[model samples]
Target: ITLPAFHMPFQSAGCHPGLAETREAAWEWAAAEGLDLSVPARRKMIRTRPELWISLIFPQATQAHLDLFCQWLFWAFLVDDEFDAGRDPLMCERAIARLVDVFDGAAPNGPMERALAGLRDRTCRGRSPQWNRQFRRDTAAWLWTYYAEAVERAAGQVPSRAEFAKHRRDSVAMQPFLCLHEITAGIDLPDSARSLPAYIALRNAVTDHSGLCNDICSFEHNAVRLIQRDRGSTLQEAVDEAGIQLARIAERVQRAERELIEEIEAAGIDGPTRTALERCVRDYRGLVRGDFDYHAR
Candidate 1:
């Protein structure tokens, strides 16, 4: 059951300027929160990877926003490990329901819940419950994707390429991060605003990009190796096909983003709303651009 050697399909771009500060701050916060990397699972995979995530996902964040983003990230990683490694997603699904309650301003009784409660308090300052409620729905839907994928894996099912496409999107759990960009940038767009054609197009492009990149980076991973087994193909072939898919997706992202900017300009928005909308778009672009660099490493 040996997997073939693989190289990342994407090239490196530079990291964000605040990588150092947020990275260091996150390490300290992890310690304070008892996310001890000395533990076996936390040692490398969890501890070493989050700084790259911060650099990529929140490049333009303010120091305050950066700190809060990192905290949310550490919490996200903890959740990721629980679902990614845990065999039974039924328990994971139930836990996510509890998290939705916490996000909805329910009292949190546990460490992770309490931490997220703090996130809601800090990052949701001055934002409407309407926005946070949508975030709860997005986060819940995102977590359900994991359980969906787990069901496939548990049954020893190898999804067809099309099925894998959708599964990959959910597996990455990107919607919450997209929602976070709005929060960190202090953008409080109503669902009506967010459901605008330009906004949804740009959001889908960024998310699909994340999904493709995840597949490319995980080409040799156990779940992805199922591609090799299914097609009777080598790992390199699987990677090559995914690479082609990534390139096409990148093209759509570029086109969608251009039209999105045009839509932004024509939307007749005001100063503060305009400013926040631009910032939100910029952060999404940062995530798209920085994704390769993070995955390449």
Candidate 2:
């Protein structure tokens, strides 16, 4: 883990406390000294990115797949909380070693057990039935390699075919739900029922928002890809493409914010959970609008 050349300023290797602390502190110091520090932007990444979260009602995915999603979210958040976000031990052999610990024993039900059960259930539930599991853990031992390598490439790191293709695949999953995690979670809320009109409005707003953001990411990734090293083609020729998406994304963001504010103001989301959910949605909205401004200023 520690053998790699120092490309990024932070050291993302083993469990050296002083090392990790120094790395994070150094980045914080750099941010404070220089312009456009990405501290807030990185934190904002956590808020906006689903690479690390467990949605109770998330569907169209297998249990093992969902478990992978949850585990990724958990580790990303925990590790970021403990270490540096940008300088993560992305390719650290020791990082995978630690992840083995997390899988074997790192959560309420213990790491592997909960993940196993959750994946099992997610696989078994429903009529048509799904695969027994997404993949055989014991047999397909190179899964993590595929996962990690995919992440490195997406972030523009040298591509490691050995790195699991997790980044590319999960990006596919997340592209569709960019800002709807909170909104979707609130679909069954008691508040949603009390004010049927507003609730319906909010749901539609969310659907529109989800669809639009999906389009935005879709266009962005594809457009970016069409380019080559340091130079590229103008996707502006595809003007109607991203423009339609941006307009819709903007519409829903504005509408959802208005609906959320009105609901909170009208006492619809009075409960603690709903209130917290409202705040998460609103806060993420701010992040989406580039209101954090850490990268800009």
Candidate 3:
């Protein structure tokens, strides 16, 4: 058995502002059908997309998870004393809070690795002179694979135990950038649970995918490019480097996705049971392909 709201009732325009028409339709169907759309697997993916962020910006309204991220980000921003105490915090918080909404609250959200769009937007907005002072290349973080995981999770598949452990290592490796920033555990699942092994396993599995999403998001080539002219490298060098890393992460995410698919298909989960899982995989595909960037700012 499938529980209530674990699987979405229908397709959505994604979590965005003025998109209540689709939300209402989906919600009504979920009510009639009886299912839980919010699960650790789903939460991992939902919290990473831009649609959810944009939704928070305008009339869409905010969720507590979004606020949770903002409250947390205050600490993240504050940690970097170079940040303008007044201006940067306000700008970055709004955008980052939105980023959390897109990733955390949206279905099928994040992997442990890359920087979120809100962070990118904040730095680019000329808010962080300290951050801006350095080249983008120098500003890389450890969440490299999460972006790819985002792609996989968008498709509704989570990684396996080994794969997730690999992700945890990769995630923790970037202690330089993330460790100082507060919490690096993206999905917020407790590390251990005496009983809920499957749930914990499932949580870690989703975190693997979620971490990959951040991986893609964090790739210097994709977003955090630094103008490292001193290295005597061309702009192509930066782009190519990011591209190569992203390509590698993409390959891994694809495999993780395949593993999830095979496991579920082999587990005898079919029909609606399978469909729900499949929907998450499909959504992750969209996220990887840039579906979540529609209203990204």
Candidate 4:
């Protein structure tokens, strides 16, 4: 299926300097984890280039940080594939539970669990308690959504457009990725700033934009499919509708970002908090461009 025309006005900071090494490291990590990747899955990973994608979103990250993020991307993609293949509901539930246990500091029982444990330790190492808490919360939401989608798939269920949109936000895993941005940038948004309406709006807009863009680009299990099923529209119409939704979310991202900056300045919130908030805006802009560029490639 052809993807409808879409564009992002934001500019990416470009791929990270350590892209080559990071790519190798990610594959090596996957190998060490003993992931059961099919031959086609291996080729798919190479083609999608997770390292390149992460590098574009986090262009300024240190090599070490970039390596960690790349590994996380690999792990997440592998786990996503597991669910996408329509595993038994009970099996999916147990697999998700094991990962949840690892997140809660349990000793890992297998390669996948071990990989996740290593990621959790690295992510939490120097982060504050609050930051770690937020990361766990976001991750829990991501995992739950995956299980929810798996259940639906097993039942031969296709969610309505509205339902899919809501589920897609968390299932896309952008919240956890956003947390990684703060860690790599060495600046966390303070509670006060994070609670602001403008900040919340910006965050949701970024998350929705990311998900919608993925839906538009993907060949199946995307919003276009739901639009077609829900509205009885042709493939072209559904794709066009998805494109319109993406454009609207992109506009919201721009407006929310501007409002957030204005609100921060007007509140006289100078210092690290302001710095972090502004950095978040910049990161979101880069992410929008980075994600679209990755799919376009």
Candidate 5:
């Protein structure tokens, strides 16, 4: 079956100058955490190229910020691999709980926990309390979704397309990365701005686009698999259907971005807040295009 081409409308595409250095440094960090213990694991990690992926998404990030985000990507992938392997639900739940504790100032217990804790410390540096709180919540939501899916799998349950679509948003863990856009850009959005209807719409639109794009690229346990099972269709048909959904979602992302900018401008919200919001719009667009570009590579 032939895969459909991605017609990305966003023109944002660029790599950070520190891509090579960040890649090597991230690998060294991962190795220190025992993430590259085996040859096969090392090969898989290198192939994923977490550093390059983050560099594409956050092209303007400082080398230090890029390094931190790259480490996060690396650690996130390891967590995803752990859960995707179908470990025991109880064990998965316990491990996820420990990971969540890192946000609450608990001392990290193992390599995974320690890595995440270090990330938390660095990420929270000089950020507002509101941002820190939201980041913690987003991170917990991301981790728990993995356990939720594991439990469902253990129970021999097959979620419907709608159910899977809703869960996939958080399961993909794009929310925290979206939050990181502010960190990398050194822009802190106020609570009032974040609460705006247009802002929320744009955020969800970007999150959905990121998650759906990943589902399209992934070979196993993706939305295409659900479509095939739900409709009793062939692989190609399911892929086509998934592609159509993704295209519509991309359009929604673009529309939401335009609406947000219009709302911000019309509300007389000028100055640093408005500028930050505008930069946010650009960053969101980059995220969509950057993710698509990474998968294409």
Candidate 6:
């Protein structure tokens, strides 16, 4: 299928220490996990979106954090390819079920399963129960949405723009990745802090930004082409429409984020917990801004 044309406003790329090393580590990790990094499909996958795998996920991450995040991205890419490559919807559901079961101490029987099993152990090793619980909850929602989209794809169905926006939230996998902000930055917020309105708004704003960014970027993707075709538009027309939507969503997220920051500043937090909260806020805001760089680069 001829892919549709797409263009977006670009942001500057952020430089992180050890990006080259992290990329190599990803290849090695994939190889060790029995995922052939050199296979044409997998190779193309990594080459075309290495920025997303590394840059977006950990915009400011160091070697230790970068390597593990690379592993996480590698695992996610494998699962994504399976669904997009036409894994049966029923099988997709079963596959997701098996993955969610891993959080419950169930055995994992496949490469993706094994990878998550290992990654989960590493990430949750010293995490708070609240944090870990949130991780599994976010993860389950992500997997379920993947299965939901798989069902649509399997049946050759395209959703309305509103429907797709809602689906894309979970599909973007922003929640679990944001949870990693805590682990990687070594600043898990207390449940009280995490539940703050500002914190949740910040997270949602980032998620919306991520979902919109993916839609803008995926214009040429086969899945996106299907949506474009369903809209009965020419490739150029689809591109124009997506560009408009992207700008609008970007404005909304920026406005929400600004208000969130103001609220955080005025909240009068005190003590070491205040310092931790500040660190977490700064880290997430960095991820939000750095995502633009990732897309732009």
lDDT for each candidate structure? 0.68, 0.37, 0.35, 0.85, 0.82, 0.68
Best prediction by lDDT? 4
Worst lDDT run of 10 residues, candidate 3, spans: 1-10
Tell me the spans in candidate 2 whose CA falls farther than 4 Å from its real position: 1-188, 191-235, 264-269, 286-297
Error of 5 at 100 (Å): 1.0
Most TM-score-accurate candidate: 5
> Could you tell me which residue pairs clash in candidate 1?
none
User: For each candidate, how many residue pairs have backbone atoms clashing (under 3 Å)?
Assistant: 0, 12, 58, 0, 0, 0
Model 6 lDDT tens row, 77-196: 776666663557888777788888886789877777777888888777888898888888888888888778777776787777667666676778878888887777767667877777
lDDT of 4 by residue, 1-297 (tens): 667777577876787889999999998888887767889899888887898889888889999999999999998888777777345778777878889988898999888899999899888888877788778888888887777877888889878878877888789888888889998888977678879899999988888988888877775368878888888999989988888888899899899999998998899989899999998888888888888887777
Residue by residue across 55-108, what tens digits does model 3's lDDT show? 332222243323333322322322222222223334444433444444333332
Clashing pairs in 5: none
Q: 49, model 6: CA deviation in Å?
A: 3.8
TM-score of each: 0.81, 0.31, 0.32, 0.93, 0.94, 0.82
Candidate 5, which ten residues in sequence have the lowest lDDT sum?
Answer: 33-42
Over the stretch 64-110, how does candidate 1's per-residue lDDT look in tens digits?
77777777777777777777545566775677778878877789887
> Which is better, 3 or 4, measured by TM-score?
4
lDDT of 6 at 209: 67
RMSD of 6: 3.9
Which is the better candidate, 2 or 5, if ranked by TM-score?
5
